[PDB]
Amino acid sequence: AKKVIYGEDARARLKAGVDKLANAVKVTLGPRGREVIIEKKWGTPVVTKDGVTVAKEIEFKDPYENMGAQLVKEVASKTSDVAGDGTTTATVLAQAIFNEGLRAIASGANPMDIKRGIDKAVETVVNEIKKLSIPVSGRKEIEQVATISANNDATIGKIIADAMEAVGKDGVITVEESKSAETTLETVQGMQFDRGYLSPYFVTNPDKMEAVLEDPFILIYEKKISNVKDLLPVLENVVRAGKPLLIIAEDVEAEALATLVVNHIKGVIRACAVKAPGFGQRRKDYLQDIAILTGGTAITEELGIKLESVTLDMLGRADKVIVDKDNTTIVGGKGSKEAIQARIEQIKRQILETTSDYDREKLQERLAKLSGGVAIIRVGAATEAELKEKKARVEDAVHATKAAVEEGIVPGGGVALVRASEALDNLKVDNADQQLGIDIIKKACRTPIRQIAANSGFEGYVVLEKVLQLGKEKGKNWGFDAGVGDYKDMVEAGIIDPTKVVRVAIQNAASVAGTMLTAEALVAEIP
Amino acid sequence: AKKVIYGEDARARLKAGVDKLANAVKVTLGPRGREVIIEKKWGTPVVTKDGVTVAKEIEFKDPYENMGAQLVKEVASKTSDVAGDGTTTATVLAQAIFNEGLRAIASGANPMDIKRGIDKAVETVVNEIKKLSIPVSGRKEIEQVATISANNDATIGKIIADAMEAVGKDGVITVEESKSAETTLETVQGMQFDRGYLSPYFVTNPDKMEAVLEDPFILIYEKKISNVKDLLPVLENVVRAGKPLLIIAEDVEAEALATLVVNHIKGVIRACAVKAPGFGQRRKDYLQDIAILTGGTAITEELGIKLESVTLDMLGRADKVIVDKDNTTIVGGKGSKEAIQARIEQIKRQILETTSDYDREKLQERLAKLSGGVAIIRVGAATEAELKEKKARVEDAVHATKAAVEEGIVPGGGVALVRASEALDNLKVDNADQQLGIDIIKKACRTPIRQIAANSGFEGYVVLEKVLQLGKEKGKNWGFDAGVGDYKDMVEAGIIDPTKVVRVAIQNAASVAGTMLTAEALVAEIP
Amino acid sequence: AKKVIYGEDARARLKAGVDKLANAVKVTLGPRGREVIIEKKWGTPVVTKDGVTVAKEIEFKDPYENMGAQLVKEVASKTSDVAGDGTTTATVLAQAIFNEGLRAIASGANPMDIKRGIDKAVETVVNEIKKLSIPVSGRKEIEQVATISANNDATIGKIIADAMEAVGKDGVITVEESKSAETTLETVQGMQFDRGYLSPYFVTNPDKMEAVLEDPFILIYEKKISNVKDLLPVLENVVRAGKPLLIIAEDVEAEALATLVVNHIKGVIRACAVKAPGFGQRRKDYLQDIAILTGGTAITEELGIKLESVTLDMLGRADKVIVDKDNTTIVGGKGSKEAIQARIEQIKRQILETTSDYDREKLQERLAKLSGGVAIIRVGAATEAELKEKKARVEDAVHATKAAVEEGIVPGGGVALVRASEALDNLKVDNADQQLGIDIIKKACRTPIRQIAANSGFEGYVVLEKVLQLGKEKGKNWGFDAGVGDYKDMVEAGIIDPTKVVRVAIQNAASVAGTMLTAEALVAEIP
Amino acid sequence: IKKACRTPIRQIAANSGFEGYVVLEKVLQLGKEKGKNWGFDAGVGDYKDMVEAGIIDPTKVVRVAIQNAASVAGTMLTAEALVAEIPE
């Protein structure tokens, strides 16, 4: 059984659902915004300042008010997926557009023309935002962006700025929970995986349980090695060379393992054996990428080369390798330089191909393995409850800092949307209803700065008027510093947000709110 | 347990059910019609302007009112299945016929004679519609039809007009969700399938991961190739020929794959191997269609030819082939021209045979593969909520544009039904009750234009009277432009809709409404 | 469906939940604190004075009051995990910080700045606590710490002091339930495991069912021994040696067992056979540690040495071994001294590595086996109800005594927090709200001493004022002895707490309470 | 008391149809920029000098109102028991 409501009754239910969801989220906006504790069924509750986290948990008893809440939830979800930051701003913008659109529709305006006017206004706003953008120059902007996104935490900003400096432009930063109360940064460089240490006798540094080989050869092979006769010829050539040898295979099993460790123990050779990384199809994907930067050959099953047929020529050359219980890493290799950027390019074009089938971030992980280093930021706190909140802030700053590198930075504190809305006064359309949609966006663009001031204990409209007049008296970048409560140059003060975050938030908010405004009837099941 | 209601009580329940379903659907009619949000149990709600989508979700608690709603739901469902457009118009027509029929029956008319009179009137209306039809001349009518069906979206109309131009008359247009916010058109030509790239070493263009073969042979074979001795004789011949060779087989396994890649790596030959498309019976269906246009032989199991017995003569010839991870395509072939025309005639004659057993659109896909190209329109939007609405509009315009090619165009905005109803004044019958049925259709035919004007903020009867007098003063094609609110020539203004959509809508509406009018008793279970 | 509450209503629910949980726990604080009986679904109820045990069972019907209770439960849980003592003090501190923080927020202070001020104050308090710490000198401080942690039980303190003296610094103390009413201390030294006594005929002391071997050889081997021909050579050369031989193998099966016992019965050789300890991967972990301190070789599978190829050189030497139904222990061996230092050194560094994968305390067990002895304190009582309470007190004192060895001791009775809070008067910050957070910690630090006095029948504020003035008149270590009710030097009187317990309790309490103070909204499911 | 003293001006602004807190902030700013007598006129929505405009009140009315309101509120804050007859 279904019930259908029309007209003002339908919009009243939608507005109530949107408002209730937005009210809970909007309390976390700004530097002086407060946190929301979310009930978890099993275990301790979750305390979070993250906008999309709060929105994902919101559901209502009324079916029609729930429909409004679910639609606006997609604003925060899409913003989080694309930008990773600005979810609270997007939710605030979505509520402002919907509320103003309802007022315009209540005056008799055509909902379709209002949506068309909204679309035109956003295109102008996005173009104005891009013109106001500033490229990231160096560590100063990186640290400033990270500090602001981490809720004005200088400690987090310094760590992330160091992390980006170490891993370079092509690096990948990962955030994990630390086992202690301290927060540490771990950076590794080279092609490293999660195997190694087949036997305890493969030890060269007894003080650290680490096996380090100086100028070692590597053996890339895709199947198990268990026959002694096929295993012998490679070391027969290797012992002639005299350099250490490292085994990367499916498994070194029984007799083949036995002869390798015993021969190593006698001291005639220096060798180690590790498992090859991956499972299923990851075997071909990983070993090929391991072989490309080592200067050797993968010796795959397709090449049709037996173990006895191998020689020193196709064995790759490495400088140093370190093997422990879990981690095996290589410092460098003999692989040609032009090959790695070809693989780097091949992955980047494959991103569009992989996006249709991927479910893991291994697409980016492979890129950073042969192009730089991967940093792991271990967030630590005295108690898990504080750890969850701190880890969320670090992840928010990491995502925001990455976006700043891509599309530059913009003045923070909502000033960028205020400046962009100033260009909407010159935009004119032939349709009166489409003009109303433009006015809706202009009012909505100035909403976030008012909400930030309201959360800080200041009147939103008083701040907005001063910021508007400061654009002409002082400059575009001048705004309101809600942290301490005065007006200053936001860019010089370090209060900046990525251009991507601002652009994504306004585009997502208008897309959902504009679609919602064209509704006339709601169909839902009778409880 | 059952309860039976009779007479006026039975018709009252049916009218309430029909009206409630029609009221929800009719709000989406016209260029200024508004959308309906439909609750979904899991996930975000669906916002749609599509008439049949809204009608499919409607259900009522009262068993007798539900029977009325379910019967009218078949009007929109059948119209969508046959024409793909005009579902809202069909629902509006069905309500008008049922409401007018109830009034005539309440005066004492025979329901059976009313149904007979309705059937006669529809035959006259359909004949008048065909007389008013105009054949599609070129891209201008195609773009105009697509724009109107897409709710006056010029961007969608331009893309679909380009898509039809590229794929020709025999092409197939597919609509898919884009991974980005932009909407793009992708067109491929020739026989292509979803296999390829057996081994990574089959690369001729490292800059695009594409294996392109210049003037290659193809090997059509239906089973696995694993034996070494049977594979060699075909390469012993083509290495004499020297041109590239491509393998289409169930699988190239182990040793047979090993010798192929190693031989290719050494540079003596250039070759690639792909899987045969389809599953189960589809292998036989597809390989024969692959072999027919390449000028070679399928080398099927029935022919009883071993691998060693093959030669160059039965191997087909192709100009270019491109192989990647998923897509393998052929540009041309040596197949005889008269053979494919037989195949397309066979498939078209098999359409009536396939319609009794098919569950997939592969019947048309095979048609366009060897007779033209297939276009994929990737609809993109910032948010999935807007994406679903945009994709629905594109699909509606694609179906409407195809129908316009088949049976021509006719003036839009409900003018065609108004002009057709004018011919019902000259139709006379000997039975008074059958005359009432004719008058029912005449009133119903003029309902959609009134509803469109009502949705646009204009009085329906005032618009209808002006449109009726404009038929004599100006011409048949003159109507009311509800988009801007004036009267103009609909055909010249580009406000046109397919003749098939109009013909199907009136026929389906009268078939169900006429059947319902003959009811006297309703039997339903007691809740 | 969810409901969201804001502002004062949200904090009121949180305060009620925190207070109700804290009120139940706080009745157990101090030497004159009382116990809490906890209902168990099956079996007798549990009577306990342990703070974290009481807190773990607390749950409330109101969803929002439950969120407050669950958050504070993490204070006691984390304190118990890290320190093992002071859970009641941590819960009392957490309630004091939250209650004072609510009052400050109700005056209009910024919650985020209050949290920042709290963090700064705790850093000063922890630094002051470390300055006030005193290292443990010997048995006197060890006995005093154990006595206080065991609720002023001199019998428990004497036993634990003896246990630490026997096992040394690297030893491990285990607490188990005794089968009788008496409490006994059992200490074993050497590498001992839970196997032995394969056959009843391996008896050298018929007065105890103990097989004692004088200067025996041990055979370390990882698989079953069942073939007679491979089994003979190991006795063929040890019978030449003439010393007793002991078998450590996966199993001695059938014929190999038969020839071993029969030859022993004849008196020509002295021998015994035991199973090797561990399951799964524990075989390689344990036999290697067994072989390292005996001076022999593990003869593992990787070494590729057959049974017939063994000799006396690779067999280790030991002084004495005792074998019974369950326990097999070795007194000493021929292992080189520096080898076991490295193994001890290898293990402590492996603690950080195995902490991410371990689920058993075998990390410390392996370290204690070759570095000293392990002690088992068997707690006994007349009835199981008293046994559970007594065992909990012993475990509390064992954990507290271990913490005292690590980070030293500090004056007890809450004096240390009072002295540390005195240093907060000199701490100043530029932010007024951050200053309020400092004052919150200062009041909270003096709460536990007031609660202890309240539980003892004295006025908390009267005691606190006297203790504050005694710091200047007499000294830092002077405090209130709640046991008898007078003021004296706590360090000289033996009322001392570990520095680790005090430091952990204040850090955990502030981490949780500060996080909850920043909340503004609560989201929970509607029941 | 400071919050209470600033309540009647917000109520007057709210009744006339303006935002009370915005009006209060403007009046506070005008105290330093223009003078103490500057305030908000409610008959017409503009800020002007109340003394010059003739919108003035006796100082006895203001003095008595704040004293009387604080007196009754103080007694009710410390009230501990209410005694009333059971109805009917």
Ligand SMILES: Nc1ncnc2c1ncn2[C@@H]1O[C@H](COP(=O)(O)OP(=O)(O)NP(=O)(O)O)[C@@H](O)[C@H]1O
């Ligand atoms: N000191 C400051 N003064 C003024 N505005 C600030 C200051 N610090 C940050 N902001 C602005 O406040 C906003 C960031 O607050 P935040 O609560 O992270 O919003 P969000 O990014 O929309 N939400 P989330 O997705 O949870 O990070 C941006 O518009 C910043 O420019």
Ligand SMILES: Nc1ncnc2c1ncn2[C@@H]1O[C@H](COP(=O)(O)OP(=O)(O)NP(=O)(O)O)[C@@H](O)[C@H]1O
């Ligand atoms: N600008 C216009 N002015 C007047 N009539 C118009 C205009 N644009 C479209 N129409 C008419 O409106 C109808 C199309 O509206 P639409 O809402 O698509 O109806 P439908 O096709 O019955 N429903 P659906 O199945 O959802 O597409 C046709 O009769 C068009 O001829």
Ligand SMILES: Nc1ncnc2c1ncn2[C@@H]1O[C@H](COP(=O)(O)OP(=O)(O)NP(=O)(O)O)[C@@H](O)[C@H]1O
């Ligand atoms: N005789 C005493 N006089 C004064 N204070 C004492 C005395 N004995 C112990 N204390 C103090 O009382 C506290 C220990 O009581 P206890 O009930 O164990 O608290 P807790 O350690 O926080 N709880 P739990 O984790 O259950 O042991 C410490 O602060 C001791 O210094």
Ligand SMILES: [Mg+2]
């Ligand atoms: Mg943010």
Ligand SMILES: [Mg+2]
């Ligand atoms: Mg349509």
Ligand SMILES: [Mg+2]
């Ligand atoms: Mg204790």
